């Protein structure tokens, strides 16, 4: 059935972007998903989003700036050491100059660059361009 809420949400977002929507109803909100969205917002790819609280798993609706090329999960959240990062990023995201590879790291979720700055690698959630 659901397994990875986050992945599904990201897929939905991607679809919305492709269509050229504006708004998009990410249907089960999750702390992790919220965090991811926040991160995205910080690096400009997403606009506002109104996490609507039901009395259940919440819905988010999210405001899109027509700016994302793709966003994605990389399931199997592979543990990833700090040295192992570079190769992974080469494999994944389109240019060294841009895109972001989001890790959950014991210092909260943050992008590959952030991780590098810190020192800790961790488990790899997803990415955008």
């Amino acid at each position: 059935v659901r397994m990875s809420v986050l992945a599904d949400c990201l897929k939905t977002i991607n679809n919305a972007e492709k269509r050229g929507r504006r708004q998009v109803l990410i249907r089960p909100s999750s702390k992790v998903v919220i965090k991811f969205l926040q991160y995205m917002q910080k690096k400009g790819y997403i606009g506002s989003f109104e996490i609507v609280d039901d009395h259940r798993s919440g819905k988010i609706v999210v405001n899109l700036l027509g700016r994302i090329n793709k966003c994605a999960v990389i399931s199997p959240r592979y543990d990833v050491k700090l040295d192992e990062i570079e190769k992974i990023i080469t494999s994944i995201l389109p240019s060294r100059l841009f895109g972001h590879l989001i890790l959950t790291t014991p210092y909260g979720i943050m992008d590959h660059e952030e991780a590098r700055r810190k020192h800790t690698g961790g488990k790899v959630l997803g990415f955008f361009f």
């Binding site: 400009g44 700016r67 090329n69 389109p94 240019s95 060294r96 100059l97 841009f98 895109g99 361009f129």
Partner: protein, 224 residues
């Protein structure tokens, strides 16, 4: 070399009403006459000239009630060697004629390709900006940006296309039948085209529009 221009854009280009082919690209205008392209890339005046090549002359048979009926598809890559690449096809009875047709086709095609950088920007862009990937038929190719000193790691045909485009340094892939040369070429072209239509953090800016040739010079076209 004088020619009576049919289309409006062509007419405009006949005089010095347009600066660069860049302008025409900007407003997504349909270039009809190869004459326009020629005018924009002459050996005199202009810097880099359009170096062409007949990358493939494949013979191609129709099989009528009386034997075969061979035509020749020519493919040509045309190239500035700096920004502009083009890829033309023409099926015709004689080889020379086909080639001629193909050059015109290539000119019509002619596209601007964004060269970018690997790592960080130093003097003059060189590779593709990001992994761009075209498909045509089975063959899908993924140009990946490389560091400066790399050459075009890739097939001969891909190298040929990429030099014309004005990419110096790249990494090719190729899923699918690359023996089918035309398709491969098409794929490469598609990939190149994708470079502008990508939308990088560079281009978040909403810069107000330029005025098209057709509104900026409409008054001048009323005379003819």
């Amino acid at each position: 070399k004088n020619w009576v221009p049919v289309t409006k854009l062509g007419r405009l280009v006949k005089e010095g009403k347009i600066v660069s082919i860049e302008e025409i690209y900007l407003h997504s205008l349909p270039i009809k006459e190869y004459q326009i392209i020629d005018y924009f890339f002459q050996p005199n005046e202009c810097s880099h000239p359009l170096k062409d090549d007949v990358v493939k002359i494949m013979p191609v048979q129709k099989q009528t009630r009386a034997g075969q009926r061979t035509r020749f598809k020519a493919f040509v890559a045309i190239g500035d060697g700096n920004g502009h690449c083009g890829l033309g096809v023409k099926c015709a009875k004689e080889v020379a004629t086909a080639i001629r047709g193909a050059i015109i086709s290539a000119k019509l095609s002619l596209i601007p390709v964004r060269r970018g950088y690997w790592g960080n920007k130093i003097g003059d862009p060189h590779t593709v900006p990001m992994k761009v990937s075209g498909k045509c038929g089975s063959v899908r190719i993924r140009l990946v940006p490389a560091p400066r000193g790399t050459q075009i790691v890739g097939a001969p045909t891909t190298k040929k296309m990429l030099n014309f485009a004005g990419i110096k340094d790249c990494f090719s892939s190729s899923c699918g039948k690359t023996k089918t040369k035309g398709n491969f070429l098409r794929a490469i072209f598609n990939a190149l085209s994708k470079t502008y239509g990508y939308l990088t953090p560079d281009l978040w800016k909403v810069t107000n529009f330029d005025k098209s040739p057709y509104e900026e010079w409409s008054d001048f076209l009323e005379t003819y």
